[PDB]
Write a protein that binds this ligand. Structure first.
Ligand code: MC3
Ligand code: MC3
Ligand code: MC3
Ligand code: CA
Ligand code: CA
Ligand code: CA
Ligand code: CA
Ligand code: CA
Lengths: 376, 376, 376, 376, 376
């Protein structure tokens, strides 16, 4: 994740132009290697045509250069790339939306599961840990960064996501599929036990806990789906052949011919095909957006920070269910205790953002006395 | 936010043409500086070509002017800008949709949390204040206007969003991440305490309160997500290079050459490239839509009024949970108490809007007696 | 709202061609004035060129006519108009989807709030009236037709939407923002009072009532949002300049020159630029779709019938909660009381629509005996 | 509804080519009449030009044929048709999604409403019948097929959807709007009565019943909305004029001129304008998709089978709430009662579909011993 | 399903280029037969023109070759294919999203339905089996792979999805429609019986069970809808005629003529029409994406693995409700029992993914002392 939200807060002079001076997550980082290969091939062909070929061979190469230059437009690269990248970006944001957060669940576990004694602490910690464990099991199944951090269940044990007892239980339950679903069943059974043991006072609170946990389950299932059901390989191959064929053709059709023949469109021989390179930049960068985003759980600069999310979820969830359980700030009358229309102040830097309320678009309509009178 | 909803209520003669006479939130305000730089560069190049260059240098410049003018169309600016701005507008409206409003929560807190005594008042005020505090913590994390208004937690204390006790508690809980989630945990624990203390009469009402509060939490999480997960920097750089390369090329390809040579398409030498300027207006304004909307929590004219929303939420929520708690208008028989078919009157200005009911599209189908008869 | 659903039920010969003979909500009604101005300007320019200008001035005008005619295509009107109108149509249908209907709420109020005495009647009527009042307050804030019908809160009192007591209470609560939210708080507190007074038998029914009411609140909030957050004025100005610049250019580039010069594409001098007029019809009508739909609560022919919806909601909701409360048709054995497979008859006009059930796409797959046998 | 799902299960050789040999729901059925009119007009113009016109008149007709042929491309038919048909297809699938099914409701009514006696049977049948009656009232309001089957409420009585008592009650309640909402109010009041009479044991079950019923109400409201709020007539007229103007122009611009003059692009005189006819097929068929789908409740081949859905809903719902109420198959130990890893067999035809489980995309990542070691 | 998620984790050099070396689910596999037919026809026409035709016949064929070559662009294949394939891909992902998973339901059944005795085991197994049976009945109705595995209800009995008693009960209930809905009614009635028998302790838990089961019902209904309501056959025929007409025209317009005549664009006679073949690859592969995805439950390589999902659902659901019922790992203090800020370790391979928390986009805004001061 490369965040530049602060740099584009306002539409200032050359707002997006300042972003062209970024390297991490940059288009340069993504397609400099492909561009170097393309440039090498282009100039190898240029030197072959300019030095090796004979007069008749050079004429036959020139005829093919103008034949290829007329079909470079026959390729509908823009359409294919436009639909495919839109599909990849949609899937990318859905995959983010299906990253599980324990915040709703941890608030309900902190509130509903009672007891300041060791048993209450252990019960709350175990429930939240089940939620975190389910999340990490799916994430290590779908995220290469998380897998590299936890290449085995024993690593999850050493890192504190799973106890040795939980590891043994998981081994006992092993089926020939992903076992990421197990902690949800454990959670449901432990919540039932807590309710029967009086730690959850009412079954409506148990229903709320199970609802939040099942929401997390659905998110983890969606992550499994996106990891398993790739964008059809045929659609990916179609877009790839469009881009590569376009630039393979450009490798010949965009050669600078001998100006002597004075072919139409070859009057002046510049050495660098600047607009060909700009088209490469545009089309290959647009494809590289898909190439980076198609699996957003990899290790690209703009891929999701799954490891950070795992660490932050564990810390936050344990703190909320253990230290913050029935641990509230003192409840005292606030600053506006007897102020009917509170008006919090503005700093000198923010005074310009004070606004009158928008009352609705009809507020300033003017009508005559006769217009406003009800009719029988 | 520049509201013009009232001006476009009806499709009147030149409805959208009257909007070209607006300055605030206008396209002129957004790209006058870039346009001035472009115009300066265009005329500097014009004077260089017309005065400095020699006959042969002028001919070589003219050859490049017609070479560049033929590739200005090779750029697929329309496609790149069309997909990117659609993505930015989608994200912009989602970000609005994820601005938290306490209205549902404050109705449930006003109704469910009982007691006209000081303790009931304090409990209701504290719960609603927790909701407002969570909202303001995330908003100051994502909105430059709100941050400038509350550059520190001490400012939140001085403005009445947070008590000194709440500030101390937040400091005690500090982790190396955003603490905007804390007030939700506080809310859940305080609602549990209110239920156990008899201020909430049934656990179904507590479930309702926690559901509304968790909805606000999810909205605040979405705001955090949009602030953190920028549109991929590669996609932004691709669109930026498309626009800038197009107009850099136009800076040469759209020069007015000497009419003497009588080049095709250069017959008449106008001094102002009116259609080039219109293309600049169109493409750069379309890009400036993205530049303004990509971070809708900045300080642009059309950015969201986060400060107003904060103030209005605090005022409304405190009034609803404190002054309006069990404070109802007298319940008396209405104007249509014994009128089976109430028909509220129309003013002379509104009589034209009285309509017969639409009964469905099948209402006027005509069938014969034999057509309408059931068959055995 | 111009409904033509019945005319397009079937794909008949020239189904959409018969719709070109409609005036109300027609494209003619929307852009006849603009077209008359355009036609007047076009022929004024034609007469100026044909009569006033000298030979050399006419030649200079002709050179500019063919210069302008070559850039009329440089304008990407189709793209700009295509994205903007799609955004406007999406917002238009969302705004419809957020029009509040009391039907769910009124069924729950009719069922749950008990008592055939005057107090039960008054309680049910007051709750449904709160829902209607919230709806009308937001609608008069966002709809010019509703505002013209209720230009003041006193008009709401005279029309029976609000009692004098409710009006006084609203004045007492006045804040410098829209007060459309107040009736929801009133509803929540009155429902709580009804539950505590035994008129609502269980708190689960109170939860259901509050859920439906909060759904209506969310819809009203969405209406407020769409009224307040206009489509960015920059995007509207961009599309407007695209259309107007295109046709300003056409005003010169589409002039019929003197055939004598025999310019390419000016061989025959027709007096009416039929295809220019068709382009005007197309592009300006496509823009007029946005101009009419951008604020669907105005007074255009195809704008929503907010007044009708208000009247119909009041009538229906009062009837459901008052006259239909525990007022059921006699419950008796039906026509198929002992008929295992009911087959309601068809008329002679409908016999053709009787179909066999679709059993699924796999139903007709044929397999051999050996193919169908399970393997160990 | 023309189902071809079975024919396109696999991407076989010429999968979509075999579908060109279908008549029902075919493009031929939809635009053969328009095509015959177009062909007649084209050849009438051909014979007029070839026989009636004089040499000078023929030359003036030829000049107009090449003038019209150059603007046939000026029409942006593809854009207009592409956005409009996408809107129509979106609305078409939403309208399907809002067809009410009693399956959720009938399961809850079968389970929750108790009693094997005549009163329990009558209560369950009456509740499900209310749901079916609401559905049929809206469907006969919006569907021409259903209206033709039930052209009056008396037909609903004769067909068993409504009892004479229900008909009398509906007449007593008559307001000047669609009364499709009434059965929901009846349902809510009858469910309340059943709860108070002990036939529904807990108010949570009553909440579930009312939730499902209100979901059906919302679907029926959406159907009413789509029937009432047509796609703006202006947008429909714009697309219609685009298509018709294009082909009116083609009627002249696509005439085969005399080869003698040897005009560019008229070298060889074929009698049939094959590509003009293919363009007619394409554009008019794309428009006919909208013409058929714009009202999917008509009587086109691909319109929804509303009558079948009505019949199937009545049969299924009555069977589920009456015959299947507490009528369960014997509960006995299953085939895998003591088999920890059940493996249901495969037939010889399905053995090829047995797969190993996908374990996640990270499963095959290989790391060294040192890479896998945790760091302090 | 061909998963390549692991290969595209990172945007590496030629990431998508390595995918062109895949056969299963490849574009080659999908359109090699059509391409062979096209190539055969192209070269048959080439040999006919080059050998059979006389001088005048060859000239007439050449005139038609350049006439056809000018209309190959008149076809708007890109637009038609672009909208249709987007619709097919949307439907494809919705169909995946509506594949039922028992995970939520099985967690609730494992937790809520009590008893370690044989009766509790049998009740839990029977409920989960009802859910699985409903899923398999719909899947065998819509999936050719599942139908081939279970070509009769007797096969479902032999495979253990249905008992002989359940089969007899289904036969007794037979109506002339799909009976996939029956197991939901059975589930609701059996859950009611379990609640009345004390196996479900509270009706809120029964409400939760029925909610999850009804969610599965809605998913199965959506699957039935997508199987029944095909994409309109007219839209499919339109796209098919676009592609086939384009390439039929190319069969003549893309012939290599005799270079002797030196026609424009036919200067050099290459034997293989490389760009025609690339266009075939592009357009026909883009169509083959739709052809494979239009019914994603077939037996294509990229079709869903319905059989695997069926097997995995049965195994997982039975294990969760039977072996894991109240079978929890020992609850013991975790690794961070008294560690306020848990920091799970990183491996040497993952150390690079450790990040500082993102605190929000406003975090680094700098303001002066005077700027930060509140104003009165
Ligand atoms: C192409 C871009 C070049 C840059 C623009 C040229 C400079 C335009 C004049 C300076 C801006 C107006 C002054 C201002 O600061 O204005 C504030 C005021 C309130 O803003 P409001 O009217 O939105 O409310 O606005 C008003 O005086 C009333 C609004 C009048 C604005 C009309 C501008 C249309 C023509 C510009 C293109 C030439
Ligand atoms: C290109 C734009 C130029 C402006 C239009 C030219 C003026 C057209 C005639 C004046 C409008 C009709 C008069 C009217 O006020 O009409 C009301 C009436 C009810 O409206 P309704 O029919 O929608 O129901 O309509 C009717 O008389 C029946 C409907 C007949 C309208 C047919 C117009 C098609 C041709 C126009 C283009 C030339
Ligand atoms: C370009 C448009 C001009 C109008 C069309 C020309 C007239 C085509 C023949 C008349 C229609 C078929 C007769 C019919 O009423 O058919 C019913 C039958 C059932 O319908 P079903 O096969 O969908 O099941 O269909 C069948 O006989 C089997 C289906 C055979 C239809 C093949 C038509 C493809 C070629 C047409 C273009 C030339
Ligand atoms: Ca990646
Ligand atoms: Ca901004
Ligand atoms: Ca309007
Ligand atoms: Ca239809
Ligand atoms: Ca398939």
């Amino acid at each position: 994740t490369i965040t530049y939200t602060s740099q584009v807060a306002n539409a200032r002079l050359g707002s997006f132009s300042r972003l062209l001076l970024c390297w991490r997550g940059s288009i340069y980082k993504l397609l400099y290697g492909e561009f170097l290969i393309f440039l090498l091939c282009y100039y190898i062909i240029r030197f072959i045509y300019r030095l090796a070929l004979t007069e008749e061979q050079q004429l036959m190469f020139e005829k093919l250069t103008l034949y290829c230059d007329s079909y470079i437009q026959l390729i509908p690269i823009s359409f294919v790339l436009g639909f495919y990248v839109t599909l990849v970006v949609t899937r990318w944001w859905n995959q983010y939306e299906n990253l599980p957060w324990p915040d709703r669940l941890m608030s309900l576990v902190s509130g509903f599961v009672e007891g300041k004694d060791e048993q209450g602490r252990l019960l709350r910690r175990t429930l939240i840990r089940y939620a975190n464990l389910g999340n990490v099991l799916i994430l290590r199944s779908v995220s290469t960064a998380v897998y590299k951090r936890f290449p085995s269940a024993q690593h999850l044990v050493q890192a504190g996501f799973m106890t040795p007892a939980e590891h043994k239980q998981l081994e006992k339950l092993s089926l020939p599929h992903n076992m990421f679903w197990v902690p949800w069943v454990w959670f449901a059974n432990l919540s039932m036990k807590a309710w029967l043991g009086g730690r959850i006072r009412d079954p409506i609170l148990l229903q709320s806990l199970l609802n939040e946990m099942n929401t997390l389950r659905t998110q983890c299932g969606h992550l499994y789906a996106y990891d398993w059901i790739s964008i059809p390989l045929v659609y990916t191959q179609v877009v790839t052949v469009a881009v590569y064929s376009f630039f393979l053709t450009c490798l010949v059709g965009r050669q600078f011919l001998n100006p002597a023949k004075a072919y139409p469109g070859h009057e002046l021989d510049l050495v660098v095909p600047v607009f060909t390179f700009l088209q490469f930049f545009f089309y290959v960068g647009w494809l590289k957006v898909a190439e980076q985003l198609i699996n957003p759980f990899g290790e690209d600069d703009d891929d999701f920070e799954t490891n950070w999310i795992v660490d932050r979820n564990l810390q936050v969830s344990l703190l909320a269910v253990d230290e913050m359980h029935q641990d509230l700030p003192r409840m005292e009358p606030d600053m506006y205790w007897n102020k009917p229309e509170p008006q919090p102040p503005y700093t000198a830097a923010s005074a310009q953002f004070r606004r009158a309320s928008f009352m609705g678009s009809t507020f300033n309509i003017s009508l005559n006395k006769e217009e406003m009178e009800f009719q029988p």
